[PDB]
Design a protein around this motif. Structure first.
Motif, PDB file in Angstrom:
ATOM      1  N   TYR A  10       0.818  -1.205   0.000  1.00  0.00           N
ATOM      2  CA  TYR A  10       0.000   0.000   0.000  1.00  0.00           C
ATOM      3  C   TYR A  10       0.855   1.260   0.000  1.00  0.00           C
ATOM      4  N   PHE A  11       2.031   1.211   0.636  1.00  0.00           N
ATOM      5  CA  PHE A  11       2.979   2.314   0.527  1.00  0.00           C
ATOM      6  C   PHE A  11       3.328   2.585  -0.931  1.00  0.00           C
ATOM      7  N   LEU A  12       3.458   1.526  -1.731  1.00  0.00           N
ATOM      8  CA  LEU A  12       3.721   1.691  -3.154  1.00  0.00           C
ATOM      9  C   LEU A  12       2.465   2.104  -3.910  1.00  0.00           C
ATOM     10  N   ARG A  13       1.290   1.678  -3.437  1.00  0.00           N
ATOM     11  CA  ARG A  13       0.041   2.204  -3.976  1.00  0.00           C
ATOM     12  C   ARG A  13      -0.064   3.704  -3.726  1.00  0.00           C
ATOM     13  N   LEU A  14       0.302   4.145  -2.520  1.00  0.00           N
ATOM     14  CA  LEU A  14       0.341   5.574  -2.230  1.00  0.00           C
ATOM     15  C   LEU A  14       1.351   6.286  -3.121  1.00  0.00           C
ATOM     16  N   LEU A  15       2.510   5.661  -3.346  1.00  0.00           N
ATOM     17  CA  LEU A  15       3.511   6.240  -4.236  1.00  0.00           C
ATOM     18  C   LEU A  15       2.951   6.441  -5.639  1.00  0.00           C
ATOM     19  N   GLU A  40       1.024  -6.915  -5.584  1.00  0.00           N
ATOM     20  CA  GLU A  40       1.277  -5.581  -6.116  1.00  0.00           C
ATOM     21  C   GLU A  40       0.072  -5.072  -6.898  1.00  0.00           C
ATOM     22  N   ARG A  41      -0.467  -5.909  -7.786  1.00  0.00           N
ATOM     23  CA  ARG A  41      -1.675  -5.545  -8.522  1.00  0.00           C
ATOM     24  C   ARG A  41      -2.900  -5.539  -7.614  1.00  0.00           C
ATOM     25  N   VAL A  42      -2.970  -6.482  -6.670  1.00  0.00           N
ATOM     26  CA  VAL A  42      -4.081  -6.529  -5.719  1.00  0.00           C
ATOM     27  C   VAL A  42      -4.233  -5.197  -4.995  1.00  0.00           C
ATOM     28  N   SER A  43      -3.115  -4.591  -4.592  1.00  0.00           N
ATOM     29  CA  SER A  43      -3.152  -3.321  -3.872  1.00  0.00           C
ATOM     30  C   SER A  43      -3.602  -2.148  -4.735  1.00  0.00           C
ATOM     31  N   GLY A  44      -3.837  -2.350  -6.028  1.00  0.00           N
ATOM     32  CA  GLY A  44      -4.367  -1.309  -6.884  1.00  0.00           C
ATOM     33  C   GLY A  44      -3.381  -0.673  -7.842  1.00  0.00           C
ATOM     34  N   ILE A  45      -2.154  -1.177  -7.924  1.00  0.00           N
ATOM     35  CA  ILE A  45      -1.145  -0.608  -8.812  1.00  0.00           C
ATOM     36  C   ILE A  45      -1.403  -1.111 -10.228  1.00  0.00           C
ATOM     37  N   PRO A  46      -1.564  -0.218 -11.205  1.00  0.00           N
ATOM     38  CA  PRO A  46      -1.858  -0.662 -12.573  1.00  0.00           C
ATOM     39  C   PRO A  46      -0.722  -1.482 -13.165  1.00  0.00           C
ATOM     40  N   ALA A  47      -1.079  -2.301 -14.157  1.00  0.00           N
ATOM     41  CA  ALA A  47      -0.091  -3.140 -14.829  1.00  0.00           C
ATOM     42  C   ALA A  47       0.943  -2.312 -15.580  1.00  0.00           C
ATOM     43  N   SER A  48       0.540  -1.162 -16.128  1.00  0.00           N
ATOM     44  CA  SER A  48       1.478  -0.326 -16.872  1.00  0.00           C
ATOM     45  C   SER A  48       2.626   0.144 -15.987  1.00  0.00           C
ATOM     46  N   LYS A  49       2.327   0.512 -14.744  1.00  0.00           N
ATOM     47  CA  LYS A  49       3.342   0.945 -13.792  1.00  0.00           C
ATOM     48  C   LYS A  49       4.090  -0.225 -13.162  1.00  0.00           C
ATOM     49  N   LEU A  50       3.872  -1.446 -13.647  1.00  0.00           N
ATOM     50  CA  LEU A  50       4.302  -2.654 -12.961  1.00  0.00           C
ATOM     51  C   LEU A  50       5.003  -3.592 -13.935  1.00  0.00           C
ATOM     52  N   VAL A  51       6.102  -4.192 -13.484  1.00  0.00           N
ATOM     53  CA  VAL A  51       6.812  -5.223 -14.237  1.00  0.00           C
ATOM     54  C   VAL A  51       6.917  -6.456 -13.345  1.00  0.00           C
ATOM     55  N   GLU A  52       5.996  -7.404 -13.519  1.00  0.00           N
ATOM     56  CA  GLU A  52       6.067  -8.687 -12.818  1.00  0.00           C
ATOM     57  C   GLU A  52       7.155  -9.516 -13.486  1.00  0.00           C
ATOM     58  N   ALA A  53       8.349  -9.507 -12.889  1.00  0.00           N
ATOM     59  CA  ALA A  53       9.538 -10.001 -13.572  1.00  0.00           C
ATOM     60  C   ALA A  53       9.634 -11.521 -13.602  1.00  0.00           C
ATOM     61  N   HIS A  54       8.932 -12.229 -12.723  1.00  0.00           N
ATOM     62  CA  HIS A  54       8.927 -13.687 -12.765  1.00  0.00           C
ATOM     63  C   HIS A  54       7.584 -14.262 -13.196  1.00  0.00           C
ATOM     64  N   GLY A  55       6.668 -13.431 -13.677  1.00  0.00           N
ATOM     65  CA  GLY A  55       5.373 -13.906 -14.125  1.00  0.00           C
ATOM     66  C   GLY A  55       4.284 -13.637 -13.105  1.00  0.00           C
TER      67      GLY A  55
END
Ligand SMILES: [Zn+2]
Ligand SMILES: [Zn+2]
Lengths: 273, 13, 274
Positions: free
Chosen positions: C90-95, C113-128
């Motif tokens: 959530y700290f990263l969601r706030l970020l 990371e996505r569950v907390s509301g961070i969009p996929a565009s701002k996110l790189v799930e590096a191991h899938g």
């Protein structure tokens, strides 16, 4: 099924042929900074040379590019600087009593021989500073021969070739010593497996934990449960988890060897210093 | 063949 | 040289307007996830039944083809809804909400990371991630939800026209890293501050990315100890918030003055969650 039971087996010479597998776990009580941790130790010193990464010290191409970082490390661990701890002498006592079959070590400190264990009883799987081989001459030289140059911050060179004299250490990618292949003989015939302070991250070393027959009990005194011991245990497994020195000490007491142990460490410290 | 730093890696490419 | 106090003031002053974050299993363990099954854990005991040669065999593809039941056992745990995101996520969601996040490179498959509301565009799930899947035969894309029923019923998804195994998008040992990983070329030079949260950095090219940032860029390491290229090759403006991960994040939030705004976020998201 329990640590005392193993001690009683050894104590009665029921386990007469012991194979031991030790790691950098038993060396750190001796003060040796083998781990090359981020805190005070060689780490900062080897950073002077601007390595690409800490494990680059044990690469052959970089060493040929710049061999000074490896020899910097060598000066530290080279024999006569650090002393063996209680573990190393406990295994010397196990040898003297005729119980030790072989000691497979992942360490290059050399404290195993310092503690009095003969070379025949030893498989130094990552190398040793007891010999050296000229990178050009390909001539073998005893350890002491290069001590002067190493201890004087110099780089040893072969006498006839004047090429670099690299200690016999198994650099990253080099094949393990022929001495490693004794694992084929030792482990089936072993009467008890002792594991002291090894992460078991290295899979060629780790695979040997299951090599012993199912009748053989396996004693793991390492701080945590790791390797095939943790992943795929057997019924006769014993895990003396906790600090390595304390675990070995408890086993020595449980063997009734505390008196003889104090005698050994004292008179051997005298021989060394 | 001892402690090869790349023991197991998910290749980037 | 520099302290967490100094970093907080910089963010507070909008000096660092483009943040790249690198997180690992450190941030998931406060949520109770056993991402590694090494300790004695419920997920650990079940996987020993299948008699795998070693714990990482489930991530290796050839063993899976031999027996896919252990991997899906793991999947059954991590599928969204079982575990919750903690303060870190959530700290990263706030970020993100404040417009500061540039990209979040994560080593985790939990998906919090996505569950907390961070969009996929701002996110790189590096191991899938278990949010999508592809038939191992027709190579047809399916959303995570599609195979949810079969996974939770100890079943093995077979797809409609192929009747072949439907593997989720998880980077197996030997598989190439996700396409999205190649954003490191763009993101990292443009970043003005690098945050590392609970990552050992013993695996590359992850570790290698710590040096990608500019020499002006400070690097904040909240991991319990100092690890990875940070220890071997540190910078002057680097800050090591060593210690328990949640403690470091909480201190940094306090130093940023967002605790008030922080409590509101955790509340409204916990409500939607259950
Ligand atoms: Zn020579
Ligand atoms: Zn299909």
């Amino acid at each position: 099924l329990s640590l005392q039971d193993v001690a009683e087996l050894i104590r009665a010479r029921a386990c007469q042929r012991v194979v031991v597998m030790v790691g950098a776990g038993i060396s750190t009580p001796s003060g040796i900074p083998d781990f090359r941790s981020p805190g005070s130790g060689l780490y900062s010193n080897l950073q002077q040379y601007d390595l690409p990464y800490p494990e680059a010290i044990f690469e052959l191409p970089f060493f040929f590019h710049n061999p000074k970082p490896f020899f910097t490390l060598a000066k530290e661990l080279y024999p006569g600087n650090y002393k063996p701890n209680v573990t190393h002498y406990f295994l010397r006592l196990l040898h003297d009593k005729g119980l030790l079959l072989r000691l497979y070590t992942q360490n290059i400190d050399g404290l195993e021989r310092v503690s009095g264990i003969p070379a025949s009883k030893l498989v130094e799987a990552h190398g040793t500073f007891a010999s050296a081989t000229c990178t050009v001459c390909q001539r073998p030289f005893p350890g002491e021969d290069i001590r002067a140059d190493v201890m004087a911050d110099r780089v040893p060179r072969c006498p006839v070739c004047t090429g670099v004299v690299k200690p016999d250490i198994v650099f990253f990618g080099e094949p393990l010593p022929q001495r490693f292949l004794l694992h084929v003989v030792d482990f089936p015939m072993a009467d008890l497996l002792l594991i002291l302070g090894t992460s078991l991250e290295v899979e060629p070393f780790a695979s040997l934990t299951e090599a012993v027959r199912s009748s053989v009990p396996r004693l793991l005194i390492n701080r945590d449960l790791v390797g095939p011991l943790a992943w795929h245990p057997r019924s006769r497994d014993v895990a003396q988890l906790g600090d390595v020195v304390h675990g070995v000490e408890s086993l020595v007491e449980l063997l009734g060897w505390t008196e003889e142990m104090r005698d050994l460490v004292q008179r051997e410290t005298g021989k060394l210093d | 063949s001892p402690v090869k730093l790349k023991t197991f890696k998910x290749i980037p490419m």
